[model samples]
Target: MKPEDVIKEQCARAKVVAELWHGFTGGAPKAALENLVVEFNKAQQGRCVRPVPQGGFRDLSTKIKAAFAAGKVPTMAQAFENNIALYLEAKALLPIESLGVKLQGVNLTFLNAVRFGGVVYGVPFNKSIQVLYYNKDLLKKHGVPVPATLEEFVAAAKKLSRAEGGPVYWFQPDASTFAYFFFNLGGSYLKDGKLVLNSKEAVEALTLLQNGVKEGWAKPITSGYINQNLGSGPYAFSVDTSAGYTYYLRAAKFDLGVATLPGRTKGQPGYGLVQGTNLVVFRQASKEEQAVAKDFLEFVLSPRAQAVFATATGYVPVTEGALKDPVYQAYAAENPDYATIVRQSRYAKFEPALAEWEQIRFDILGQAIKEAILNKADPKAALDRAQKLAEDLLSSR
Candidate 1:
C-alpha cells in the first residue's frame, strides 16, 4: 500500500482519539491549534485529534509530569528541548521515525532541535527565533542607520540616547538574549562536556550589554513585555523573539522594522537563538493512539496548516514549504517583517538539549546576567559564578 493508504488503514483500524496537551491557553495560538484540530478531525475517518490546553507553559509542564506519574499521560504534548531530554531519560517518548513518518521539507535546524543520538523524538511546532525590532521613525529622526554589527548597534544606541532623558534601546536582561550575543561573538555554553560560560567571548558578550546600560543608551527592563515599551516608550530598538511580531506591530505607533539581530562584525549575517517547543508522542499511549497522534503531527506540520498557525500566532513556520505557501506569501507581502524573520531563520541555533538547561538558563545564567547588567558587577565574575553553578548542577545530575 502507498503511504497515504497505509496512514488511512492505520487510522481506520486505530479508531483512536489522541489528546495533544499544549501550553497555548489563549489568544491566536490557541485558536489556531483548535481550528487545526477541527479540520484534522473532519478529514480523518476513524481518528480524531484533540487539543487540550493546560494553562501556561509551566502549568502544562507540571500537569504533564503529574499525569506521567499517574500513568495517564496524553498521547502527545508540546515540549521544549529540555523537557524532551527529561522524557528521553525516563524512556517515556516514542522516536518519531518509529511511526514511519517522513520528515521531508522540515527545517533542518528545527529537526536538530528535537534529535538526539541520530534519532528524531519530536517534531518542531510553534518555533520562533530572535529578531531585532526597531522604530524606523526614531532611527531616521536621530540620523542613525539600522545597525548591522555589534559596533554599529552600540554607536546607534549612543547616537539616539538623550542622556538623562530616555534610553534608545530597551534591553531585556535574559539568558536567550545573552545567548544570541554569545553565539554571534564565537562563544559556546558547553563544549566537550564542560561549561564555558566564563570564556573570553562570553565575558565580552555580557560586557557589551553591561556597557550599553552603564553608558545610558540602553535601559534595562525587568518586567512586562518589551513590545509593550516599543509601542509607547522612547526606545529606538530591541532584540526580541519573532513570535512577538503581532504584539510589536499592534503596540508600535511608529514605523516598525524587523531585522535579524546584529552580528559581531559588519557584513556578516547575524545569528538568532531559536525559541519555543516541539510536539512529542508519549510512550504511555497505545500503539493505535500513537498512530493517530502521528497523523495529527503530519497534519499540523503540513505547509498549509503551518502557514495558518504562523500567520495567526506570529510564530515562524517549521517547514520551508510553508514559506512558499500562498497563505504565508500573501501575509508576507503585506507584513515584510515576516519575510525578514523567515530569512533570518537560517542563522538560528537551539540551546543544548540537556534536562538541566532549565535551571542553568533561568536560575544560574539568568542571575549572572542580572548581576552584570543590573547590578554593574564584573562580567567575568558574574559568568564565572554562573559557570561554577552550572557545572555543579550538571555533575549532580
Candidate 2:
C-alpha cells in the first residue's frame, strides 16, 4: 500500500492530493501534509482541510518554514536544506527555537548546515541514505561471499562475470551515488574551493574502475537507467535507499540482501552518502496560520507517523515509536531483506554541506565514477570534472 493510502485507511475522511511538488522542487509530501490537514479539520469538527484545489503542500522558504515548525499553514509546505541557507540569508523565515521546544527525536541529518548558534531552521521530512543492495542468489551461485576487501570485491565481480559472456555487475560513478563514494575514498574533485582531481587516490580509484569493465568485471549503468532485473541474478549490487523500499517491493519478488556502502578496506567507514528533502514552513503565514502548521508538523513526528513512513514508503522510520509498532516489526520479521536496510541505515551520512552540490546532482556523480571504473577516464579525471564544476558553482553561490 502507498504511504498515503495507509494514512487514508486510518482516517476515513482523509482528503487526497499528490504533494507532487516533489522531485524537481523542494517541498513536503502533499500526502503527509494532507494527512495532517484532515486531522486538524477533525479537531475543528468536520470541515474539509482546504479548498478543492487546496492551496496545499507548497514550498515554504525563509518566508514560511518557521511557521510550519511552529504549527501554521492551511496545508503543509516545505523546503530542503539546499535552499534553507538562501532563505535564512533573506531573513524570510522565523526561528523555531524562538518559539519553544524542538522535536525530541526528529532525525535532522545534513540539516546541520542550516543551523547556526544551535538553532535548527527546518525539520526532516525525507531522510534517505545511500546503500548497496547485493543480490543473494548471485552471491550464492558463485560460491563467493560478499567481499570484505576492495580487492576481494573486484575479484568477486570478475568471478561472477566469468560465468557469462560479458560482465554481470555494474555501477555508475557519474551518478552522484558512485561519485560521492569515490570522493569520500580520498578522491576529491576539489579542495579549498579549487579544482584538483589529479590526486593519487583519485587516479587509482578511477583507473581501476575504467579498466574493470574491459576485463569483464563490471559495466556502467547509472540511476536514469535502472535495472529492475533485481530478483533474478545478472546484477549483484545496486546503491539506493532504505527510504526507497516501496520501489524494491514491486521490483524484486524474491527476498534480497542489503548492506552498507562497500568500504575500500574492511574496517573503513561506509563510503556512501545519504539524501532526503526537508519540510520548511514559509514566510508568508500569520501567527495563527503558523500555529495551525505546527499542529500538522507535530502530527508528522508522532509515533504513528513513523509507522506510516515505514509501512507505506519503505523508508525506515526515525521514531522509537515506529520500532515498537507491530505492523512495522512484522514486516521486518517477515522479510529478510529488511535487515540490510536496518543495519545500513545505522551508517547514514547526509550529503556534504557545500552549496556547490546543487550542481553535482545533475552533473552525473555516479555515472562519472562508472566511466572511470570502465577506463573511459581515470578516476582523477572523473572527479576532476565534478571538482571543476563544484569550484565554479561555489564561486557563483
Candidate 3:
C-alpha cells in the first residue's frame, strides 16, 4: 500500500471521529459534501468524519447558535465570516492556526473571508461570487450588446425597458447585492473602524438602483430567488450569486448568458462580493476531535475535492491549487457559464468580517435599500440613516 494509505490505516485504527454540521442549501451541494466525507473516512485510518445537513443556511445558523447555548456544539460547522466573529466574541471557537494547520495554496481572497483580527478561525468552503446573468434572446431582440461597464449597463437596461414596456432588470434588495454595487462603484464599507455608508460612492450606488426603479427599468424583489422570476417575464438581466447557476439554468427557457458584472468604468475590472460560508471548529470539541477536524479540513481543501465540490454545486473553488486543478479546468472548459464566474474570481472582495455585520447588513443596509427603492426616499438620506445606525452598533460593540 501507499505510504499515505498506510498512515491513514494506522490513524483509522486509533478511532478519532468528528461530526460536521453544515447548512448546504441544495441537494447537489449536500451530496458533494457527503461524498467527500465518505472519501475522507475511507482513506484515513485513525480519523472519520460524519456529515450532517441542517436544512438550509438560515436553519444552520439558528441551530449553531442553539447548539452553542446548550453546550452541545458539533466538532465543526459551516459558518459565515460574521458568524465566525460572533463565535470568537463568545470564545466558542479554536483558531485553525493554533492547531498548527498551515494552508499552503489557498486563495488570499478566500483566506481573507475566514480571518478575524489577524487570526485564521475558519477555512473557506462552498465559496461563490456575484456575477451578471442575462438573457441572450432578449439582448439580441433589443439590439443591445452585453453591457461591459456601469454606464453601459444603465443604457442597456433603459433601452430594453423602453422597448419591452416592462422592467428589464430584476433587482434583489439585500445587503449582499448592495455590497456588490457599492464595491464596484468604488465604495468602502469600513475604514479605520469608521462606517463609510454615506460616502459619495455609496450614494451613487444606491442612486443607480433608485433611478432604475424610478425610470421603470428595475423591478425590486424583496423575497424569493430571483431565478424564479428570471424567465417568467420581461426581465432580461440579474446580478446574483454564481452558486445559483444550476437553478437559473433549470428556470430559463431562453438562451442564458453569464458574464462578469459590469465594471466601474470602461475597460476596468469590476468588483464582486465574495460570498458563501466557511468551516469552523468549535471549542467544545476534544483535542483529538479538533485534530481530526483539521485533517478533514485539509482533505476538503485538497485540489481534487475542491474541484469535485465546485463542479457539482456551482460554487467556486477556494484554493489556487483547486482553480488550477485539471478536474476543474476540464469542467470549466466545457461549461462557459461557470467559466465566466471563475474569471470574475480575481475581482472578488468579501464583506467586512465584523460580528455586527450580520445585524448591520440586514437591519441597516437592507433597510436603506427599502427606503431608497421602495419608499422613494432620497438615496443620500437613506444611506445617512444606515450610516448612523451602523456607527451606533459599532460603538455598542
Candidate 4:
C-alpha cells in the first residue's frame, strides 16, 4: 500500500478525527469540498478530517450558535462574515494568523472581510458575485436585445413581459443585494458606523424597482428559488448569485445566457454584489486539532485547490494566482458563462463589514422591499420606515 494509505489505516485504528461543519448540500460544491476533506486526511499521515454538511448558510449559522451555547462546537465551520460577530462575542473563533498560516495568493479584498482590529479570524473558502441570468432563446424570440444600461434593462423587461408572450423578470433584492443598486446609484449604506439607508439615492433605487413590479415587467419570486424557477413557464430573467449557475445549467431547457447587470450610463460598468462564506476555527478545538484544521485550510488556499474550486463550483477563486492558473484558464475558455462572472469581478462590491449593521441590514432592507412590492406602499414612505428601524437598531446596540 502507498505510504499515505498505510498511515490512514493506522490512524483509523486510533479514531483521530477533526470535525468540520459547513453548509453545502448535494451538488458540485458539496462534492468538491468533501473530496478535499478526504484528501487532507489521506495526506496528513495521522490526522483524519470529517466534514459534516449542515443545511444552507443561515442554517449553519443557527447551528453553530447553538453548538457554542452547548460547548460542543466543531473544529471549524463555514460562516458568513457578518455571522462572525456572534462568534467574536462568544469568544469562539481563533485567528487564522495565530496558526502561523500564510494566505499567500488570496485576494486582499476577500481578506479584508474577515480581518478586524488587525487580526484575521477567517479565510475566504467560497466567494460569489451576483449576475443577470436570462434565457437567450426567449430574449431573441421577443426581440429584447441584451440590456446594457438601466434604461434598456427596464425596456427589455417590459418587452419580455407576459403581454409579449415572454417570461417576467425576476426581481428579488435582499438588504445586502440592495447595495448593488445602492452603489450603482451613488449611495452608501453605512458611513463611520452610522446607518444611511434612506438617502435620496437609496429612495430612487427602490422607486425604480417598485415601478418595474407595478408596470408588470418585473416579478418577485413567490414560489421556488430563482434558479429553479428560471425558464419555467413565464420566467425568463433572474439576477442571482454566480454560485447558483449549476442549478440553472441543470434546470434551463432553453439557452442559458449570463450578462453583467445594467448600469446607470450606456457604457458604464455595473457593480455586482460580492458575497461569500468564510471558514473560521472554533476555540473549542484542541491545539492538535487546530493544527490539523490549519493544514486543511492552507491546502484549500493552494493554487491547485482554488482552481479546482472555481472550476468545479461557480464561486470565484479566493486567490489571484488561480485566476491565471492554466487549469482555471482552460475552464474559463470553455465555460463562458462563468468566465463572465470572473471577468466582472473587477467591478465587484463587497458588502459593509460592520458588527452593528448586521442586526438591522436584512430586517430594514427586506422591510423596505416588502412594503414597496407586496403592500404597494410608496417607495419614499417605505424607505423612511426602513431608515428609522435601521437607526433604532444601531442606537440600541
lDDT of 3: 0.83
Task: Write down the TM-score for model 1.
Answer: 0.91
lDDT of 2 at 271: 55
The CA lDDT at 348 in model 1 is 84
TM-score of 4: 0.91
TM-score per prediction, in order, is 0.91, 0.75, 0.91, 0.91
After the best TM-score superposition of candidate 2, give how far the Cα of residue 291 lies from its true spot, in angstroms.
1.9
Candidate 2 stretches with Cα past 4 Å from truth are: 1-20, 24-78, 99-101, 108-114, 183-200, 222-233, 253-255, 364-375
- Cα error, residue 102 of model 3, in Å, equals 3.5
Model 1 ranges with Cα > 4 A deviation: 1-15
**Ten-residue stretch with the least lDDT total in model 2:** 18-27
Task: Give me the runs in candidate 4 sitting further than 4 Å from their true place.
Answer: 1-15, 356-359
Q: List the residue pairs that clash in candidate 1.
A: none
Candidate 2 structure quality by residue, lDDT tens digits, 142-172: 7888765566677778888887555666565
Clash tally, candidates in order: 0, 45, 5, 0
CA error at residue 391 for candidate 4, angstroms: 2.6
lDDT minimum window of 10 residues, candidate 4: 2-11
Task: Give lDDT for model 4.
Answer: 0.78
